[PDB]
Amino acid sequence: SKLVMIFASMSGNTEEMADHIAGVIRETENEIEVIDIMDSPEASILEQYDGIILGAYTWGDGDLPDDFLDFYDAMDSIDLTGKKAAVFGSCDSAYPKYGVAVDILIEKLQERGAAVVLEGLKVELTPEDEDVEKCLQFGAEFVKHLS
Ligand SMILES: Cc1cc2nc3c(=O)[nH]c(=O)nc-3n(C[C@H](O)[C@H](O)[C@H](O)COP(=O)(O)O)c2cc1C
Ligand SMILES: OC[C@H]1O[C@H](O)[C@H](O)[C@@H](O)[C@@H]1O
């Protein structure tokens, strides 16, 4: 199957997660294209994949990264019925609205018809060894749900 991952990372923590998850998936007989939101992908590309993984830190007052806002708006005009999807991100418990970018992106995927196949994966700040193992489990479980 043909998969896309679109991630946002300012200080590298969500990027580390993305690279682990994608590297695990690449060891299966599935293709994955990993795109940084800073490179401005158009949301319509999500219609052309079998599975979709989004990664995002949380910003401001429980908000999406600024660089995700246009893409998020454009998601209201795409049809993701049938696709399999999941979301991850780095988080900080010094904020009350912890990791809610993950929850916001899950909600939008649901509204557009995607089958969200995993709970949101939230890691505090920089992954430690156990968090990297959770990234492995997330990639492995995502693949199981494909066909
Ligand atoms: C201005 C600012 C606002 C933030 N807002 C939140 C927030 O509401 N909730 C949260 O969990 N983290 C929040 N964070 C923490 C970041 O999500 C956290 O540092 C994360 O590890 C960044 O991931 P990254 O390294 O991929 O950029 C905020 C950080 C900054 C600088
Ligand atoms: O693409 C726009 C339309 O897509 C789907 O029909 C949604 O269910 C509907 O709410 C939205 O207005």
TrEMBL record:
<keyword id="KW-0285">Flavoprotein</keyword>
<feature type="binding site">
    <location>
        <position position="62"/>
    </location>
    <ligand>
        <name>FMN</name>
    </ligand>
</feature>
<feature type="binding site">
    <location>
        <position position="97"/>
    </location>
    <ligand>
        <name>FMN</name>
    </ligand>
</feature>
<keyword id="KW-0813">Transport</keyword>
<feature type="binding site">
    <location>
        <position position="13"/>
    </location>
    <ligand>
        <name>FMN</name>
    </ligand>
</feature>
<dbReference type="GO" id="GO:0009055">
    <property type="term" value="F:electron transfer activity"/>
</dbReference>
<dbReference type="GO" id="GO:0016651">
    <property type="term" value="F:oxidoreductase activity, acting on NAD(P)H"/>
</dbReference>
<feature type="binding site">
    <location>
        <position position="10"/>
    </location>
    <ligand>
        <name>FMN</name>
    </ligand>
</feature>
<feature type="binding site">
    <location>
        <position position="9"/>
    </location>
    <ligand>
        <name>FMN</name>
    </ligand>
</feature>
<protein>
    <recommendedName>
        <fullName>Flavodoxin</fullName>
    </recommendedName>
</protein>
<keyword id="KW-0249">Electron transport</keyword>
<feature type="domain" description="Flavodoxin-like">
    <location>
        <begin position="3"/>
        <end position="143"/>
    </location>
</feature>
<comment type="similarity">
    <text>Belongs to the flavodoxin family.</text>
</comment>
<dbReference type="InterPro" id="IPR050619">
    <property type="entry name" value="Flavodoxin"/>
</dbReference>
<dbReference type="InterPro" id="IPR008254">
    <property type="entry name" value="Flavodoxin/NO_synth"/>
</dbReference>
<dbReference type="Pfam" id="PF00258">
    <property type="entry name" value="Flavodoxin_1"/>
</dbReference>
<keyword id="KW-0547">Nucleotide-binding</keyword>
<dbReference type="InterPro" id="IPR029039">
    <property type="entry name" value="Flavoprotein-like_sf"/>
</dbReference>
<feature type="binding site">
    <location>
        <position position="99"/>
    </location>
    <ligand>
        <name>FMN</name>
    </ligand>
</feature>
<dbReference type="GO" id="GO:0010181">
    <property type="term" value="F:FMN binding"/>
</dbReference>
<dbReference type="InterPro" id="IPR010087">
    <property type="entry name" value="Flav_short"/>
</dbReference>
<feature type="binding site">
    <location>
        <position position="11"/>
    </location>
    <ligand>
        <name>FMN</name>
    </ligand>
</feature>
<comment type="function">
    <text>Low-potential electron donor to a number of redox enzymes.</text>
</comment>
<feature type="binding site">
    <location>
        <position position="92"/>
    </location>
    <ligand>
        <name>FMN</name>
    </ligand>
</feature>
<feature type="binding site">
    <location>
        <position position="14"/>
    </location>
    <ligand>
        <name>FMN</name>
    </ligand>
</feature>
<keyword id="KW-0288">FMN</keyword>
<feature type="binding site">
    <location>
        <position position="58"/>
    </location>
    <ligand>
        <name>FMN</name>
    </ligand>
</feature>
